[PDB]
Amino acid sequence: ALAATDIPGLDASKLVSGVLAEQRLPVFARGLATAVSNSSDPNTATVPLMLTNHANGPVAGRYFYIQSMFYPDQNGNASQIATSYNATSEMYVRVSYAANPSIREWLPWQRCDIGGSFTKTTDGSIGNGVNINSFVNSGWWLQSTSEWAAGGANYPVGLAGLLIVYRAHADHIYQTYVTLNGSTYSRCCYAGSWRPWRQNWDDGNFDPASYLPKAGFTWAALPGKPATFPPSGHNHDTSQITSGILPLARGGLGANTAAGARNNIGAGVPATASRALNGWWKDNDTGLIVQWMQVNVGDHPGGIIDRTLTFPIAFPSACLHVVPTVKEVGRPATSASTVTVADVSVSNTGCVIVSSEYYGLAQNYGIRVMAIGY
Amino acid sequence: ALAATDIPGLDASKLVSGVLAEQRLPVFARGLATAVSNSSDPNTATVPLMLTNHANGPVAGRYFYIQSMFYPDQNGNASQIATSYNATSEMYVRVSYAANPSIREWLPWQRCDIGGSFTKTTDGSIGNGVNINSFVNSGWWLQSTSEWAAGGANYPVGLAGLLIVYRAHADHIYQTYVTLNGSTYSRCCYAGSWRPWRQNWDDGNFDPASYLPKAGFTWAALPGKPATFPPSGHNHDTSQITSGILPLARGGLGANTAAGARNNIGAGVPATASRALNGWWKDNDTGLIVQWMQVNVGDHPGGIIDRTLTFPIAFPSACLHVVPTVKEVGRPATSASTVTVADVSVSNTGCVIVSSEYYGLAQNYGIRVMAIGY
Amino acid sequence: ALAATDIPGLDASKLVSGVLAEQRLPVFARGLATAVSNSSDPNTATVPLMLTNHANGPVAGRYFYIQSMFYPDQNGNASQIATSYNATSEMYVRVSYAANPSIREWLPWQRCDIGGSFTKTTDGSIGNGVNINSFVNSGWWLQSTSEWAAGGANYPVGLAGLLIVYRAHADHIYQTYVTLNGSTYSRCCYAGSWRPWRQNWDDGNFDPASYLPKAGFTWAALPGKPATFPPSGHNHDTSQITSGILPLARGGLGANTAAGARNNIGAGVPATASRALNGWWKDNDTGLIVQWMQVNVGDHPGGIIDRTLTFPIAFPSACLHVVPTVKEVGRPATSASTVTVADVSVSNTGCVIVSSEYYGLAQNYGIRVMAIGY
Ligand SMILES: [Fe+3]
Ligand SMILES: [Mg+2]
Ligand code: NA
Ligand code: NA
Ligand code: NA
Q: Which of A167, A160, A165, A153 is nearest to A125 (CA)?
A: A160
Q: How far is CA A53 from CA A45, A372, B102, in A?
A: 14, 161, 21
According to DSSP, the residues that pair with B294 across neighbouring strands are B368
Strands C15-17 and B10-11: parallel
Cα–Cα distance between A336 and A15 in angstroms, integer? 211
Cα separation, C155 vs B240, whole angstroms: 69
Q: How far apart are CA A26 and CA B12, in angstroms?
A: 11
CA A120 – CA A137 distance, rounded (Å): 17
CA of B266 to the centre of ligand 2 (A): 11
| Overall residue count recorded for chain B in this entry | 374
Contacts of B258 by beta carbon, 8 Å cutoff, 6+ apart = C248, C264, C265, C266
C139 Cβ contact partners less than 8 Å away, ≥ 6 residues apart: B120, C118, C123, C164, C165
Task: Please report residues of B whose CB lies closer than 8 A to that of A87.
Answer: 97
Contacts of C216 (CB under 8 A, 6+ apart): A212, B214, B217
Q: Which residues of B67-90 are buried (b: 16+ CB within 10 A; e: fewer)?
A: bbbbbeebebbbbbbbbbbbebbb
Among the listed residues C116, C15, C94, the one whose alpha carbon sits nearest the alpha carbon of residue B4 = C15
Amino acid at A122: T
Give SS3 for B226. coil
For an interface test with B, the pick among C92, C93, C307 (most B C-beta atoms closer than 10 Å) comes out as C93
CA C144 to chain centre: 40
Closest CA to C48 of B67, B37, A11, B82: B67
List all chains that touch chain C, counting a touch as 3 or more CB pairs closer than 8 Å.
Answer: A, B
Q: Are A150 and A141 in contact (CB under 8 A)?
A: no
Cα of C133 to nearest chain B Cα, Å: 15
User: What gap in Å lies between CA A111 and CA A93, rounded to an integer?
Assistant: 7
Phi, psi of C44 (to 5 degrees): -105, 20
What's the C242 CA to ligand 1 centre distance in angstroms? 12
User: Residue A119 gets which letter from DSSP?
Assistant: B
Compute, in angstroms, the gap from residue A252 CA to the centroid of ligand 2: 22
Technique that determined the structure: X-ray
What amino acid is encoded at A275 in this protein?
R
A254: left (phi over 0), alpha (psi -120 to 50) or beta: left
Q: Per this entry, what is the length of chain C? A: 374
Contact call for residues A168 and A181 (beta carbons, < 8 A): no
Assign 3-class secondary structure to B24-77. HCCHHHHCECCCCCCCCCHHHCCCCEEEECCCCCCCCCCCEEEEEEEECCCCCE
Torsion sign (Cα): C233, C237, C240, C241: positive
Q: How many CA atoms lie within 13 A of C356 on its CB side?
A: 19
Q: DSSP code of B257? A: S
Looking at A68-212, list the stretches that DSSP marks H as alpha helix, in order from N- to C-terminal side.
146-150
Residue C355, number of CB atoms within 10 A of its CB: 21
Q: What is the DSSP letter of B260?
A: H
Would you say A278 and A268 are in contact if contact means Cβ atoms under 8 Å apart? no
The HSE-up count of residue C4 (CA atoms within 13 Å, CB side) is: 12
Alpha-helical segments (H) within chain A: 146-150, 258-265
Query: What SS3 class is residue B184?
Result: strand
- Measured CA to CA, the distance from residue A267 to residue A249 in angstroms comes to 17
Q: What is d(CA A280, CA A369) in angstroms, rounded to the nearest whole number?
A: 12
CB A138 to CB C125 under 8 A? no
Resolution (A): 2.3
Conformation bin of residue A31: beta by default, left when phi > 0, alpha when psi is -120 to 50: left
A282 bridge partner residues: A272, A289
The residues with which B94 forms a beta bridge, in sequence order, are B80
What does the DSSP 8-state code read for residue C219? Answer: T
Q: Do A93 and C91 touch (CB under 8 A)?
A: yes
Amino acid at residue number A334: T
Task: Yes or no: say if A217 and B217 are a contact pair by the CB < 8 Å rule.
Answer: yes
Beta bridge partners of A345: A352
Q: Decide if C356 contacts C306 (C-beta within 8 A).
A: no
Which of C114, C115, C97 shows the shortest CA–CA distance to C106? Answer: C97
DSSP-derived 3-state class of residue B291: strand
DSSP, res C6:
G
Q: Give the integer Cα–Cα distance in Å for C278 and C294.
A: 7
For residue C73, what is the DSSP state? S
B35 CB-side CA count, 13 A: 26
* Minimal CA separation from A182 to chain B, in Å: 5
> Cα separation of B139 and B117, whole Å?
8
- Please give the Cα distance from B224 to B312 (Å, whole number): 81
Q: How many CB atoms lie within 10 A of CB A291?
A: 26
Binary contact (B114, C114; C-beta < 8 A): yes
Q: What are the distances in angstroms from CA B55 to CA B39, B58, B106, C228?
A: 9, 8, 14, 94
Closest CA to B9 of C14, A252, A22, C223: C14
Best of C47, C253, C292 to disrupt the A interface (most A CBs within 10 Å) is C253
Residues in B closer than 8 angstroms to A336, CB to CB, are 342, 354
Count other C-beta atoms under 10 Å from residue C14's C-beta: 19
- Chain B neighbours (≥3 Cβ pairs under 8 A) are A, C
Tell me the pairing of strands C288-298 and C364-373: antiparallel
- C156-163's contacts with Cβ under 8 Å and 24+ in sequence apart are C156/C185, C156/C187, C156/C197, C156/C199, C157/C183, C157/C185, C159/C183, C160/A172, C160/A190, C162/A166, C162/A168, C162/A172, C162/A174, C162/A188, C163/C126, C163/C132, C163/C135
CA distance B68 to B63: 16
The identity of residue B203, as a single letter, is D
**Kindly report the CA angle at B94 between B90 and B99, in degrees rounded to 5?**
175
List of chains touching A (3+ CB pairs within 8 A): B, C
* Cβ C202 vs Cβ A199: under 8 Å: yes
Rounded Cα distance, A77 and C58, in Å: 19
**Are the CB atoms for A110 and C115 separated by under 8 Å?**
yes
Q: Which residue of C has its CA nearest to B164?
A: C166
SS3 A371: strand
CA-based nearest residue to B163, from B125, B117, B205:
B125
Instruction: Identify the closest residue of chain A to B6 by CA–CA distance.
Output: A2
DSSP labels, B306-343: EEEEE-SS--SS-EEEEEEEEEEEE-SSS-GGGEEEEE
Residue of B202, B230, C211, C205 whose CA lies nearest to A217 = C211
Looking at the complex, report in whole angstroms how far the Cα of residue C144 sits from the nearest Cα belonging to chain B: 23
Contact in structure between C354 and B337 (CB atoms under 8 Å): yes
Distance of CA B260 to the CA centre of its chain: 60
- Rounded Cα gap, residues A116 and A139, in angstroms: 10
| Contact assignment for A211 to C214 by CB distance below 8 Å | yes
Distances (CA, A) of A42 to A49, A99, B259: 10, 20, 136
Of B274, B267, B272, the closest CA to residue B284 belongs to B272
Burial pattern B137-146, b for ≥16 Cβ within 10 A else e, equals ebbbbbbbbb
Q: Is the dihedral of CA C155, C156, C157, C162 positive or negative?
A: negative
Is A234 among the annotated ligand-binding positions? yes
Report CA-CA distances (Å) from B212 to B203, C215, C225: 17, 13, 18
Go through B43-64 and write b for each residue having 16 or more CB atoms within 10 A of its CB, e for each that does not.
eebbbbbbbbebebbbbeebbb
Number of Cβ pairs closer than 8 Å across A and C? 422
Contact residues for B103 (Cβ-Cβ < 8 A; gap 6+)? none
Instruction: Give the C-alpha separation, A249 to A259, whole Å.
Output: 19
CB C36 within 8 A of CB C20: no
In sequence order, which residues have a C-beta less than 8 Å from that of residue C347 and are 6 or more positions away? C319
Q: How many CA atoms lie within 13 A of A362 on its CB side?
A: 6
Q: Which residues pair with C333 in a beta bridge?
A: none
User: 3-state DSSP: chain C helix, strand, coil percent, rounded to 5?
Assistant: 15, 40, 45
**A298 conformational bin, left if phi > 0, alpha if psi -120 to 50, beta if neither:** left
Gap between the Cα atoms of B12 and C207, Å rounded: 86
Using CA atoms, how far apart are residues B197 and B163, in angstroms rounded to an integer?
A: 13
DSSP line for C173-208 = EEEEEEETTS-EEEEEEETTEE-PPEEB-BTTT--G
Q: Cα(A128)–Cα(A151) distance, rounded to whole angstroms?
A: 6
Q: Which ranges of B120-247 does DSSP label H, i.e. alpha helix?
A: 146-150
Residues in chain A, overall count = 374
Contact A25 B24 (CB under 8 A): no
Nearest Cα residue to C108 out of C96, C123, C120: C96
Instruction: State yes or no: cis peptide before C230, omega within 30 of 0.
Output: no
Whether C49 sits inside 8 A of A69 (CB atoms) is: yes
Q: What share of chain A is helix, strand, coil (3-state, %, to 5)?
A: 15, 40, 45
List phi, psi (to 5°) of C65.
-70, 130
C-alpha span between B295 and B345 (Å, rounded): 17
Using CA atoms of B206, B210, B211, B216 in order, give the dihedral in degrees to the nearest 10: 150
Angle between helices B258-265 and C258-265 (to 10 degrees): 120
| Count of beta carbons in the 10 Å neighbourhood of residue B219 | 12
